Design a protein around this ligand. Structure first.
Ligand SMILES: Nc1ncnc2c1ncn2[C@@H]1O[C@H](COP(=O)(O)OP(=O)(O)OC[C@H]2O[C@@H](O)[C@H](O)[C@@H]2O)[C@@H](O)[C@H]1O
Ligand SMILES: Nc1ncnc2c1ncn2[C@@H]1O[C@H](COP(=O)(O)OP(=O)(O)OC[C@H]2O[C@@H](O)[C@H](O)[C@@H]2O)[C@@H](O)[C@H]1O
Ligand SMILES: Nc1ncnc2c1ncn2[C@@H]1O[C@H](COP(=O)(O)OP(=O)(O)OC[C@H]2O[C@@H](O)[C@H](O)[C@@H]2O)[C@@H](O)[C@H]1O
Ligand SMILES: Nc1ncnc2c1ncn2[C@@H]1O[C@H](COP(=O)(O)OP(=O)(O)OC[C@H]2O[C@@H](O)[C@H](O)[C@@H]2O)[C@@H](O)[C@H]1O
Lengths: 333, 333, 333, 333
């Protein structure tokens, strides 16, 4: 695997955590703003996902997790990280600032082989495991794993479209709070509503998720769009997709299609449930999106509303590894 | 006014509070489970709406608020409340148990003139101020003010329908917690999801709101339906209405229609805003529903999503008085 | 083990869950208000502690968990439960209503051998693993495991007293929300403050915890007392103990005493930490109380304030099994 | 009054808001990070304290509130603000960065007369209205209004000390979330626990409040100390003071002393209540600290625990004006 992670934020941290669980190998981490001792702390303890079981500790300027030695770098500019030295070939770009092919390339000058941007990109190829991985080729040096919401929407959209054809759809995502929000009314000049006390408000936000689905599933380009609502929950979000289908069908046909997909092609990616589940029943769930059968409702043979859950932090980080596994299987091939 | 209130819950209490503010006159209150001394307490202090300003106190088996003397009864069965004795003619049925014409009538044997059920009813005429009040006539002895959500949806639906015609619509309401939920995972045999910790979950719930709009606005019967999401906020909810219009139009045409309605026919009922508002900016707001101009988005000339806010507690209680005012203006006429 | 559980609430459920984990054997469960199908649901899903891993399912009027067959009864009166039939000898009384030796005895007429009340009792012997288990004898037919808070306080008090002697102490517990609180301002005639919206308030409550420590540790009887503060967190509480010691000492002497106890006599019961921990780092923690070294502060050689955490739900249920294990080791002895 | 405010954060904003209400005059405001149009927004809407009633609007590079014209500056360095130009003589330093006499003086080179630091200071004289104002003199050019917590503790300590003498005391403050906390686990290198998700944790923090009381009330210097607990509530905090008195007394003697003080010397500063109040019943309350009679408990004739509430944002901002009023009465004297 020889994986390298740039940035130790919610994603960076959780990806490393996911890696260890899933067996992937991380050899180096870079972050200029977080001391090595503070790293063992931020990694060991996680309010939402619990304390890391194994042993975490500093070991001669290196981070040691369950025996594994991860060398740590503190470079401010991506093109200074000596990736090659730590032997890191596949870099997970999770800083949120080097999201374009142009600037993401800096990592190459450090000895990096490939770069995976764990966020939407304006020009890098976007992928969603289970939806469009076949379009990947070794020659792609910089790719994007899209956003946590796109990863929830795309799977569901694909099944609906292939079976009944999506004519048009509007999406609303009731999202858990994000790290970019404020505990109390404060300054967010870029997003005014986003600066309002997160623990006391329902905050309307915007989202590119839907528009992005237009990139991973071309046929749907320009047929979907949506917005978000930020609510005071620490983790786990739900997608509310209202769509107009081209073919007439009963809600059962939809449930069937979903269930079938969930145990076949999209198994491990798209989940299916008929239980009376709630937000919390999905913390730590590693699927991209779980179809909530009982939650959705149908108005007419062609106008229906479906509901899909997703652990915005955990499921996404799991797909990041999956993407890298697939990439290496095709590359080292 | 000579108003009487049966039940001292969130609605009962807030209606009395609203009455005093708006000048209406409440002469009697009945509730078998709440001692007279506990009443001054539950009325004076309110976590969401603040401490009552005036003076509240017990005065010889009576409740005294700012000089006003409200006699208190403790009857368990509605047909035992001596309304006539306190001189109460218009009874606000807010217990939640006597919602049908059949059982709501009990109040008449006590000397009551008319009965207003502050909740949906299976057979009593449902009204929404600003939408269908002209359908009211003196001969109606028992009426319903629908639910807090119907009161938010109906106004918006009416404007949309009259201007562009609603072909079909699906509604989702991101609702604040209700008194029927649990602080932590507990027994809710009727609604399994409803018993899950309310402070930590996004709970999918059902709602008759949309179907009810089919009763107050006949033309829309069977063209709308929807569900809810319960989130951990103490008050104020938002309605997310995705609808397919019959006539083509631009989002501005919708904003215009709303703004126009808000300053004319529906003034005081439907509000309009273009500010970057959030959940809290509507606590204490006394309009049935406030159109959030910037929140909505349009996919096509006929497929749009509109967003409307409403203080599910306060706005509804204000409409309860309004309904009674209108009724008496037609009755004592 | 042959354990039986009466009541399927937060404690009843978690105890059964703990049992399975720890290997103890539960053979029967009784609860008149929860259908057998609703039981598999309430047991499988838990907002705070996650989804049960094993397989849970109804199997011919019985509850089956990971192969284990637990027969279910629906008796309303404790003296009708045919414990003997299911072969249940040690009953965990967790209903909260049969807490006195008098009424807890009902279980004996059903064939029960011993009864453990998972809550404070007015007359049944109270125990706290690690503190006074030596007082137990086979002849005791009905015992109490005190409350979740006593189990946190007692261990800490014992260590402090034995080493420096507690002259007097006042305790404050910042407690997570309880199942007896309200989501929004509602009727709590017994505890007026307790009926105020739990998600928006800091609610002062009372507690017998301290006074109870006077029963498990006689020498301290009448030297401790305290109150509580209910805050909007779903689980995990912290005990703030301010005490005046008889012997002079430095805060290190206290840390040492605690650390020593934690790895010796009270190992598994009292935990010790010097990390910058927070409420969540203890969800699922199975110790009765964890001493937070860095949190406490000392004013003088004899006036100090110590802080100890505890997962109010999980730690207590683990001690319930431990108590039964100890009892059987002495009984079947 | 001719007041000037530097910094438009929670304090800065609320002080201006308080000023208008109380009639004081603010002529200028400075803040380099908040655009003039964003100011009208952050001022008009406040999640916790509601929408400002009057009219707020931009008027030729100036902020206009209810007719009042407040000129706005955008200087980054305090010694560049042309205070004199706007005619601002008394500057309220609420940035949180220029808290020492040394750096707070920058304002003088801009034409400022006096400087009030709305936060603790390492070397500027600290005052608490009602406790030590008589210690102020015209020659003091830079003063501090202490912190929101000291203002709650000091009044209570003064009454207890004067009547029964405080031998030693340890204080714990269950504090609402602050603007310096994080919505989700993030980087707080200075305060590791402070970076943990504020909406899901009980976070132990430190506080100088008690030690500060040693400065405003010399006799108590070195006899008090304490810590804090940050809980997920948006506003209003409570102080838990455990103290050992020099004279023996009954809890009634304490209630009496408090009630007496509240209606006499400390009227308007120290409040008194015997109601079953909760966190929310104090939002908007403008007293420095409200003694909760029923919440406290007494162990012995000399060991008692008292509880006092305070709207950490609102009460403090009101005292800031009060301090300035007193200062000018002595200065312009
Ligand atoms: N030039 C840089 N080089 C390296 N690291 C950098 C640089 N600039 C910033 N960083 C690091 O990147 C991290 C930024 O990540 P976060 O802001 O903490 O968030 P992220 O990891 O991107 O996760 C964001 C996601 O998590 C959710 O909480 C949130 O809603 C969002 O969806 C920090 O730890 C920071 O030190
Ligand atoms: N037979 C009866 N006769 C008279 N009063 C009765 C009877 N049965 C119950 N009551 C009283 O009626 C009240 C019921 O009201 P609540 O349950 O407190 O709620 P309600 O007033 O109906 O408001 C419900 C609304 O408030 C929100 O919190 C909630 O989500 C919902 O939208 C109680 O105080 C109760 O004593
Ligand atoms: N007569 C009875 N016989 C048998 N079971 C009964 C009876 N009466 C009630 N029960 C059952 O007992 C259960 C009551 O438990 P809960 O109210 O859910 O609470 P408990 O199990 O006692 O746990 C309480 C603890 O959990 C925290 O949430 C709370 O703060 C407290 O510390 C219910 O499932 C109910 O059906
Ligand atoms: N050099 C400077 N000059 C002028 N203004 C400055 C400077 N540096 C920062 N500021 C401004 O000062 C403000 C800082 O205030 P906040 O951080 O928002 O908080 P404050 O006003 O100090 O109130 C803090 C209090 O409020 C609670 O939320 C919190 O718990 C704390 O007790 C910002 O709006 C910022 O633009």
């Amino acid at each position: 695997s020889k994986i390298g992670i740039n940035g130790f934020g919610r994603i960076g941290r959780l990806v490393l955590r996911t890696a260890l669980e899933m067996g992937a190998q991380v050899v180096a981490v870079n972050d200029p703003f977080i001391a090595l001792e503070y790293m063992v702390y931020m990694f060991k303890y996680d309010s939402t996902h619990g304390m890391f079981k194994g042993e975490v500790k500093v070991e001669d300027g290196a981070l040691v997790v369950d025996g594994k030695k991860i060398t740590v770098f503190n470079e401010m500019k991506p093109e200074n990280i000596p990736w090659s030295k730590a032997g890191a070939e596949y870099i997970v770009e999770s800083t949120g600032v080097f999201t374009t092919i142009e600037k993401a390339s800096a990592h190459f000058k450090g000895g990096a082989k490939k770069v995976i941007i764990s966020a939407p990109s304006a020009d890098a190829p976007m992928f969603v495991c289970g939806v469009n991985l076949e379009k990947y080729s070794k020659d792609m040096k910089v790719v994007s794993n899209a956003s946590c919401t796109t990863n929830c929407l795309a799977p569901v959209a694909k099944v609906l479209h292939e079976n009944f054809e999506i004519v048009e759809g509007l999406m609303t995502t009731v999202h858990a709070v994000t790290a970019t929000q404020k505990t109390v009314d404060g300054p967010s000049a870029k997003d005014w509503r986003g600066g309002r006390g997160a623990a006391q408000n329902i905050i309307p936000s915007s989202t590119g998720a839907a528009k992005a689905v237009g990139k991973v599933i071309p046929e749907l380009d320009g047929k979907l769009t949506g917005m978000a609502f930020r609510v005071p929950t620490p983790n786990v979000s739900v997608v509310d997709l209202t769509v107009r289908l081209g073919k007439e069908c009963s809600y059962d046909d939809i449930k069937a299609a979903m269930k079938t997909a969930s145990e076949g092609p999209l198994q491990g990616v798209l989940g299916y449930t008929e239980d009376d589940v709630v937000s919390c029943d999905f913390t730590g769930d590693n699927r991209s999106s779980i179809f909530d059968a009982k939650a959705g409702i149908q108005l007419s043979k062609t106008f229906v509303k479906v509901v899909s859950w997703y652990d915005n932090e955990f499921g996404y980080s799991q797909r990041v590894i999956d993407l890298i596994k697939h990439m290496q299987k095709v590359d080292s091939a």
